[PDB]
Design a protein. Structure first.
Lengths: 688, 688, 147
């Protein structure tokens, strides 16, 4: 009920470190260690106290909600070569490798998509030491003549100079590389002690170089997890970004105003002009973390340098990694195109050069299956992308996709791959949906009785008579854009009062052209403003805006520009009376930048409505994308005042300036068919 | 009864466009119309199937519970000149033509004006198509040239030329009008195309001009309405406008408040300034259907206007018809007496000009037996209007109007007038009488058990130490005035609060009628009220109204005003706190609705008691008329505030102000010998 | 403010054809107006207090009309018997009005109750002060300076 929001709070009140599934391939690699005394033997025999309980009837390991033997082989032969060194509990290995003989012909049958890290590289390092004990296993195999022969055709191409002088990503999987040096390569480590944040790449060196200061990397893991080891630790800032990236896309984050910035507190201290990574103590950066942080650092309003992308592109090619090539997966280029829209005109042109890459990169790849990822599997990854390419940030309502994000999100039925596949429950649950399919569902419930209540007032106050062809389609259109922006149950008085004066100014806009302007109108028009009920805290200064609005028609008598943008000054000034909020009076730049914001908001809709008249004449395109090349810069200049804290006017009045003008950008970018779908999706058809 | 209480709901929510009987004369006019697709027989064979198989073996056609051959010859002679003409089952032609020629002698001695509309002009239209078949038709009858003389006087009462400049109501029976210009007719039809919305016009249309649009109308009401033609379709603004007039007059409408709101809006969706017809799209409109729905909509807080009644004032006259001055029935003028009872002083005086007409129109024809009802046969014409005219709206109680209403309605016991004696089955069903009279029957036990329940309270509380004149008449009349305004069973509790605390104020009146007041009585009477059924939910609430009332007995002592101007505010102050509903703080007009209301009722009953202190004193009627014309004007504004839709004050808190002065306005206009004739009816002489 | 103007304007059409004057609600136009310019909101969250603010307008409005036919007969004196009798009906309606404003066992604030006293005292004094005297009061209080 309400405690589901409490449970995520207590799952966020205690953020120490990551929630990752405990792995088994490196559990054999840590359990294969002699004691420093040597009498105790294995160092942490809790690993044996974990394996003989975490097991299924075929003796197998891992993907207990799936089936993939290509990783499961790497935990079924590793667990038995750890079971014959100390040579305890020989009861289920002889059946646990006998099942592999049943499926030693099921090896080469998985697709090109699932090729794990260390596959042709780190797996033959298991096999030649498996036969060090010479257990009953088919060594040669005609299916294995790919990982055998093209072992070298993966590794002999990289030079031994660049791996003995320069730090690159090959320090994670290092068992496949042999005859290396330890004394000259020990100054190119990670910061906490690891070799690229993987304990196997410590344990491959702890056997030759017993670095006691690196023993405390593993000893700290078996103390914190109380036995057992996962494949990657730590994941502190990988945890933080994927927490909040789900939260604002799901739409439950607005209860957590204390907590949401607290993650952003840890990022702004560790932000650098070079980049950031999965953990903080890793040198080799990438593209994902620099990009997706910037879309979340800038959004809540922290000034963040937009020049970090200059490292991660070269020669007109935006690479996924520093110093190493990539067959470009979608999971960089999705969120790289997402942060390619929050731009300011004062920024560097590298942000311009990114979106001219990804749109050329993602438009063509929609037909064939090149949009798949080699590192994930989930319910709908590409379905989000086709929405993001055609619905930009400038015209998206903040409610339409929040309904659609439910229809694309699997939850904890989605698995990440690595060396060993795993899940993340501080990140994905079946509970974030339970919070979302509770509060959004009753919001969908509690708002459709409001339009039921908003119906009859329109049909009783004598105003429905004239205007359009039918009242009902204008009634549901005017409440959609007036409630998709403000969606919480405490500001309904602003919400419904918006939608009323929305329907007031347009049926009288219809009435003036039907008589030909205000030259031959005789009925008094300042008395229609009283059909809104009298309240004391609101309706005093409300009527002052309608009076000053009336003379814009006498101003636009015999002058042939459109009259849409000045009607936005109705909405942007009436609504704040329903919030009872002045500007802060005594501060003159507060007086200034409100007026500076009022001008540009009135200036978008002159450009937009003239475009709609220019396009519906069937005129050519080389002028109507010029209007798109004219309002692309008056949209981003609107953002710099909103996002950056340009003066001390409180944020509450600043969302609404953007909340009105995005709605007018939405009407002029959706055909009259496709909004009638979105009305039918988010309002009526209930979730569960 | 849940079969019947929901049974009205399930029947009155399946409202199509009415349910009326199949005609026997218009169905004859469409049966002779053949196919047009190169066929052999009729276009509509299932209408002649309804002709063949419905018939009652007495020989005639028409209605079942009436024998007026003024209807039957239109139902026989037109019907038998069709199926013989198509030569389809002429076996039953002699079956019908046998009994006519020896029973058509009764046509000579008929009644003057129980004749069908357009009977005297459509029967000579049958003669040229009867001698087309030339059966043994005895034309020798004095009802033949005497209507020929009326026919050529109807070729002298209708004009040819000026008729095309404006439509008139004779387009419902236009078979007596032939050989005219038809492209001048084409711009004189409604959007159904059928002239005066009647199917008989289109039979003449397919002799000249094969328009598709006058065909699909007739084809849809046979092929989708399952054979046979009605007399006028549709009937949507007659079946909704009268069923709300009938069901609310029963008084059992309280269980249907979800439903009466909707059909009233379809009245308002069809609201026009030039009136409301018997159908939705008629190009001609009446006054009686106009000035009835006007009255009902004002009685439910809607926004109406009586400025639309300058369109039937015939220079100080009124008529049912728009252009002609024919002698009408009483029910146009009966309805305009109902609507001119209540008004607001911001209007035209046309309702004054009509009420001085509608009294003086009905004043003489009450005194004689001139109760001619030309368009409706019903049970009790003069006795109902004798209740309506000889009892005013200011003293019209909601229960001495429903107890009398179980006397005049029959349900199936009516028959309606059109071109065919037809019937309705929706609002002319007596199935409600198995419910509503049983609702009064369980109402009668719902008031009987508290007759004795307030007898024993008068003894056990012992108020007879200063009781007064006569208990059993005055305990009853206090409960007559308390049960004649609140009778819903969920609110049966606070009704007993009314009749109880009223007599307490009558008791201390009989204490202070002769002992002066506070200057001779040291009696406290503070906690002496608390012999009432008393809760802590009335923790102080009765005491502050009490001592303020005794302060009026203190202050107005040795004055000469009425000491019932304080009792009137006291009762509703007592009634509401028994019912337990509070006002909000709200805006300033909300108490301004309150504080202007309580001045009006404190002025009227103080004014009203002057007349009771004048009639028995026997003074001049100039003072009587100058105490009546003043007390009517205080009423005429007062009724607006209790009957608006714009009231911020709560709904049921409003009409309680109306109810208590209604009892004050009643008993000043009645005698004790007319009052027992109401007491023995609504309490003692039960139904059934 | 302007609804009380609208409530005063609709009360014109109440006595549009009647024989009364507009004085019995001109004060209600003014006793409401001091609460506006001043923001003095009433607390009707309790039932007996709203029963008193309604009752406070009961006393004033009858006085204003009983003074109205007083002064229009005062210029005439067509019934000199009732001239010394209308005002002996008036005073014992003032006698109860000046009770409830002066007393304190109510729940209304102190400063807003004498506003009821302030309107009728401005109203009653000009009914008893001749036009020869109302000017002779003004000059020697507000124009002819002290010290």
């Amino acid at each position: 009920t309400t405690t589901m929001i409490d449970g995520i709070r207590t799952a966020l009140r205690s953020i120490g470190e990551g929630e990752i599934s405990i792995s088994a391939y490196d559990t054999s690699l840590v359990a294969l260690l002699k004691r420093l005394d040597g009498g105790d033997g294995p160092q942490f025999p809790s690993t044996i106290d974990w394996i003989v309980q975490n097991q299924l009837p075929d003796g197998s390991w891992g993907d207990a909600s799936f089936f993939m033997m290509g990783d499961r082989i790497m935990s079924t032969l590793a667990c038995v070569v750890a079971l014959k060194s100390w040579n305890i509990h020989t009861d289920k290995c002889e059946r646990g490798l006998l099942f592999i003989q049943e499926n030693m012909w099921r090896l080469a049958h998985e697709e090109e998509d699932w090729m794990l890290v260390g596959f042709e590289i780190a797996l033959p390092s298991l096999l030649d030491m498996a036969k060090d004990l010479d257990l009953d296993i088919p060594y040669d195999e005609p299916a294995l003549k790919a990982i055998y022969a093209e072992r070298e055709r993966k590794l002999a191409k990289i030079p031994r100079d660049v791996l003995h002088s320069m730090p690159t990503t090959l320090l994670h999987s290092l068992e496949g590389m042999v005859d290396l040096d330890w004394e000259k390569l020990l100054k190119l480590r990670c910061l906490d002690g690891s070799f690229h944040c993987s304990p196997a790449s410590t344990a491959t060196a702890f056997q030759q170089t017993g670095d006691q200061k690196c023993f405390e990397y593993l000893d700290g893991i078996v103390k914190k997890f109380n036995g057992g080891v996962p494949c990657i630790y730590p994941l502190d800032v990988y945890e933080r970004l994927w927490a909040v990236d789900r939260l604002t896309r799901l739409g439950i984050s607005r209860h957590f105003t204390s907590e949401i910035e607290d993650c952003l507190d840890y990022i702004f201290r560790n932000w650098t002009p070079d980049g950031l990574a999965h953990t903080k103590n890793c040198p080799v950066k990438d593209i994902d973390d620099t990009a997706m942080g910037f879309r979340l650092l800038r959004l809540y309003g922290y000034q963040v340098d937009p020049c970090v992308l200059k490292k991660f592109e070269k020669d007109g090619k935006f690479f996924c990694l520093h110093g190493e090539s990539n067959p470009s997966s979608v999971t960089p280029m999705y969120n790289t195109y997402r942060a390619s829209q929050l731009k300011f005109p004062g920024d560097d042109g590298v942000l311009g050069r990114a979106e001219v890459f990804c749109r050329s990169f993602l438009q063509d790849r929609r037909g064939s299956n090149r949009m798949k990822d080699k590192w994930a599997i989930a319910k709908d990854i590409p379905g989000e992308v086709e929405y993001a390419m055609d619905y930009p940030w400038k015209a998206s309502l903040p409610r339409i996709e929040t309904r659609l994000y439910l229809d694309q999100y699997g939850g904890s039925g989605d698995v990440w791959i690595g060396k060993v596949l795993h899940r993340m429950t501080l990140f994905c649950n079946d509970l974030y949906l339970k919070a979302a399919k509770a509060d959004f569902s009753n919001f969908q419930k509690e708002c459709r009785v409001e339009l039921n209540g908003l119906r009859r007032w329109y049909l009783r106050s004598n105003l429905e008579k004239f205007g359009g062809t039918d009242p009902q389609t204008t009634l549901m259109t005017s409440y959609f854009l007036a409630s998709a922006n403000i969606f919480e149950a405490n500001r309904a008085a602003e919400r419904l009062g918006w939608a009323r004066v929305a329907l007031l100014a347009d049926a009288v806009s219809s009435h003036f052209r039907r008589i030909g302007g205000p030259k031959n109108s005789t009925s008094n028009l300042e008395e229609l403003i009283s059909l809104v009920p009298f309240d004391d805290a609101y309706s005093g200064s409300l009527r002052e805006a309608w009076k000053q609005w009336l003379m814009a028609w006498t101003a636009k008598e015999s002058s042939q520009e459109s009259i849409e943008g000045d009607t936005a000054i109705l909405l942007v000034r009436a609504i704040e009376i329903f919030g009872g909020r002045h500007v802060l009076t005594g501060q003159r730049p507060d007086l200034w930048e409100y007026s500076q914001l009022e001008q540009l908001t009135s200036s978008i809709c002159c450009k937009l409505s003239r475009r709609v008249l220019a396009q519906e004449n069937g005129e050519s395109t080389e002028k109507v994308e010029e209007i798109d090349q004219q309002v692309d810069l008056e949209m981003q200049e609107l953002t710099r005042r909103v996002l950056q804290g340009c003066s001390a006017i409180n944020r509450l009045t600043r969302e609404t300036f953007l909340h009105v003008v995005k709605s007018f950008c939405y009407v002029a970018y959706c055909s009259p068919e496709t909004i009638d779908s979105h009305i039918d999706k988010v309002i009526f058809q209930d979730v569960i």
